[PDB]
Ligand binder design. Structure first.
Ligand SMILES: Nc1ncnc2c1ncn2[C@@H]1O[C@H](COP(=O)(O)OP(=O)(O)O)[C@@H](O)[C@H]1O
Ligand SMILES: [Zn+2]
Length: 629
DNA sequence: AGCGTCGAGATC
DNA sequence: GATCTCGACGCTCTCCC
């Protein structure tokens, strides 16, 4: 399914002259990434395009570049004004005419937009818009209708297209009403983009939007620049480990910490602030005035380094230079973990994804499923399925996590040499230095299964009890059926081995509620236990035991350049990263050159940007002129 | 009633 | 010095918009 659009890879096309002209001089880029040239060409031939790329893939270019090289205006549908504002700010920073009708623009300002569009001489190529605006306001419609007639409606871009699927992680009703846009404007090319790896959703997007035979541009959803860590969660020193970790690796960079509840966010946020870390809580419990102040401070890096957010609310804001993302608890599913931690490092620079794990968090999350009241169906059983798939990600400490994540989406092709060919972004499992031998413990398992069967006739021994008992400890509750046999086993391997008999469907768990809300998991038996007792299924387990002077100047240079962007930001009324992105800055500093003939040969440096932001930047770069050796 | 935490003492 | 064990003591949160 990962096709090759050999037809669209040619530079022989008529538009190719002007397109490359805008690609080099307006955007300032030099080389296309995977499926970029193919997707761009296709869009410019009037084809219905469907873009599937992971975060940071390069989805923005697939519609932003065609709009610049097209008669008329491209109409882009986005789900949030926050996303819209960020993209328009990036575009206006390149002197590319664009604006938006989100709804919080007063009718007077709104009308000024409709004016520039009506002249039929519009200089504006990109018009971002929210879905309820199209649905509710028939004022917008009467404008578009005029553009269609003069053949100036270039195409309908549908950003975040996964919002149309009820099977998607972010469903929106107004996206269902997008089919009415194609009905009135059938001649107009439609383009859908998404960063969803879930194929069942990818398929559903096409079915719901009723796009007739599109060009499907797929890609490997492996996140090339994310370091995946799983770490042992000693509860109650999460904040300390986060504080310690952040200060060690990324003391002066923004990040996110995801917590299950609004309260735990406040708690996490509180602990960090009083120790001198710029942390704020972020969730739906905040007043609207508060919410706006948080995102002001976090996005612009003005008095807030870290937000402590609930998953639902954390999706609502973003910045491209998020250097780390920490999950304080255990995510509900692997797709969820992937999309959540995936939003780190959109700017393509290395970023870290830390999951704090303990199996205790499982029983908590297990009870949440039982409680909630939309209806206890055998679909909510699947919420349990996803959960088990998540634990597997955490318990698997040998197989490359990149393979594990992609395997969950069923991605085929990925080379397991990646972490080895790319040491700088290796995951923890491939980071783990030593080897381990797998042994057969069927003998040991039989005794165990027998033990549980005897005292169950729900359950009467939790995992901890069972481990203490089988470890031959002195905290053990009963020294009868298997006391002292896992004497060989450490309390690390004894633990994991017990975590692996609840993952092979060998021992299920009991969810008794307590004399209080925190539920306990008594151990029972798992269906497959007899296929083991039959003399059939075999079991296996795997016991687990200076800077140089020029390099010093680029650091100093890069330091000043960042603040200059921050200042230019407040002046031009724009986020600091919509001036120069992190990669642009990093390459500028490493040249130490003031020669514009060398600077324009760097990604992100354009004639316009080096003209209205140049003077301030070149001044700083002049100081290091005597170092460009 | 289970469960981390954590100081004191065993063990390497 | 660093990791383990024991066992007394203290806290346990139907989540998210
Ligand atoms: N082909 C490319 N060449 C150079 N830089 C690129 C390219 N594509 C994207 N980028 C850079 O990557 C950053 C984010 O890419 P973006 O298109 O926003 O990814 P996505 O839209 O998938 O989130 C942008 O700041 C842009 O400068
Ligand atoms: Zn790996």
């Amino acid at each position: 399914r990962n096709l090759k659009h050999e037809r669209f890879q040619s530079l022989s096309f008529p538009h190719t002259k002007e397109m490359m002209k805008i690609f080099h001089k307006k955007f300032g880029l030099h080389n296309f990434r995977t499926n970029q040239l193919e997707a761009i060409n296709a869009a410019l031939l009037g084809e219905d395009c469907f873009i599937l790329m992971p975060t940071g893939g390069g989805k923005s270019l697939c519609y932003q570049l065609p709009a610049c090289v097209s008669p008329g205006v491209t109409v882009v549908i986005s789900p949030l004004r926050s996303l819209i504002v960020d993209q328009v700010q990036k575009l206006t920073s390149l002197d590319i005419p664009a604006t938006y009708l989100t709804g919080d623009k007063t009718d007077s300002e709104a009308t000024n937009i409709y004016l520039q569009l009506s002249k039929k001489d519009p200089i504006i190529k990109l018009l971002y818009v929210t879905p309820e605006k199209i649905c509710a306001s028939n004022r917008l419609i009467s404008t578009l209708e005029n553009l269609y007639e003069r053949k100036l409606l270039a195409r309908f871009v549908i950003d975040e297209a996964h919002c149309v699927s009820q099977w998607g992680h972010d469903f929106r009703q107004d996206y269902k009403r997008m089919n009415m846009l194609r009905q009135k404007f059938p001649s107009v090319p439609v383009m859908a983009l998404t960063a969803t790896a879930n194929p069942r959703v990818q398929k559903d997007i096409l079915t719901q939007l009723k796009i007739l035979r599109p060009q499907v541009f797929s890609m490997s959803f492996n996140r090339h620049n994310l370091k995946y860590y799983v770490l042992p969660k000693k509860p109650k020193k999460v904040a300390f480990d986060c504080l310690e970790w952040i200060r060690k690796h990324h003391p002066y960079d923004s990040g996110i910490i995801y917590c299950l509840s609004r309260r735990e966010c406040d708690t996490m946020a509180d602990t960090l602030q009083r120790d001198g870390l710029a942390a704020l809580a972020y969730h739906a419990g905040l007043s609207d005035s508060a919410r706006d102040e948080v995102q002001q401070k976090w996005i612009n890096q003005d008095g807030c380094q870290v937000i402590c957010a609930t998953i639902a609310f954390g999706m609502g804001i973003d910045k491209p230079d998020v250097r780390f993302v920490i999950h304080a608890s255990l995510p509900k599913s692997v797709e969820g973990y992937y999309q959540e931690s995936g939003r780190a490092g959109r700017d393509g620079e290395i970023s870290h994804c830390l999951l704090f794990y303990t199996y205790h968090d499982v029983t908590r999350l297990k009870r949440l499923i039982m409680m909630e009241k939309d209806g206890n169906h055998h679909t909510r059983e699947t919420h349990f399925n996803n959960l088990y798939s998540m634990v597997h990600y955490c318990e698997n400490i040998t197989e490359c996590r990149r393979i594990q994540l992609l395997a969950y989406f069923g991605e085929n092709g990925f080379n397991p040499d990646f972490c080895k060919k790319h040491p700088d972004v290796s995951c923890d499992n491939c980071c783990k230095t030593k080897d381990y031998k797998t042994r057969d413990v069927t003998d040991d398992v039989k005794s165990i299964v027998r033990f549980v069967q005897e005292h169950s006739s729900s359950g009467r021994f939790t995992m901890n009890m069972l481990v203490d008992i089988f470890l031959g400890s002195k905290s053990a509750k009963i020294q009868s059926g298997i006391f002292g046999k896992g004497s060989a086993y450490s309390r690390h391997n004894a633990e994991r081995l017990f975590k692996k008999l609840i993952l092979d469907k060998i021992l299920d768990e009991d969810l008794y509620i307590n004399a209080n809300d925190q539920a306990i998991a008594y151990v029972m038996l798992g269906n497959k236990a007899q296929t083991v007792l039959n003399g059939n299924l075999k079991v296996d387990f795997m016991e687990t035991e200076k800077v140089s002077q020029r390099e010093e100047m680029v650091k100093k240079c890069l330091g000043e350049l960042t603040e200059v962007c921050k200042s230019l930001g407040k002046v031009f009324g724009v986020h600091y990263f919509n001036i120069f992105n992190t990669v642009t800055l990093k390459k500028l500093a490493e040249s130490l050159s003031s020669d514009p003939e060398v600077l324009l040969q760097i990604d992100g440096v354009t004639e316009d940007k080096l003209e209205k932001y140049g003077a301030e930047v070149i001044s700083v770069l002049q100081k290091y002129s005597e170092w460009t050796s």
